[PDB]
Design a protein around this ligand. Structure first.
Ligand SMILES: [Zn+2]
Ligand SMILES: [Zn+2]
Ligand SMILES: [Zn+2]
Length: 89
């Protein structure tokens, strides 16, 4: 326990105070940026932002709806569906 940064209970072990602070978005006071779709947390706005785009029409795998996972033939069907069936998520 020297380079083993523990968040009392809810960190197994991090190697940097900032790494633990990335999780610590709940109790820290600063609050970094987590993907509100799943879990994936980062310091820079672009890194999670494009990872969220990965879920949108499912650029992460094949084709899905980020919001209700209806599953479509093409991303066009997803984006067309999301703009109509999700005005207020
Ligand atoms: Zn914690
Ligand atoms: Zn995500
Ligand atoms: Zn949907």
């Amino acid at each position: 326990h020297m380079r083993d940064y523990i968040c009392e209970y809810c960190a197994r072990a991090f190697k940097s105070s900032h790494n633990l602070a990335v999780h610590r978005m709940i109790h820290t006071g600063e609050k970094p940026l987590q993907c509100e779709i799943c879990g994936f947390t980062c310091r820079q706005k672009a890194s999670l932002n494009w990872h969220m785009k990965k879920h949108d029409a499912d650029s992460f795998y094949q084709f899905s709806c980020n919001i209700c996972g209806k599953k479509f033939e093409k991303k066009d069907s997803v984006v067309a569906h999301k703009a109509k069936s999700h005005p207020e998520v």
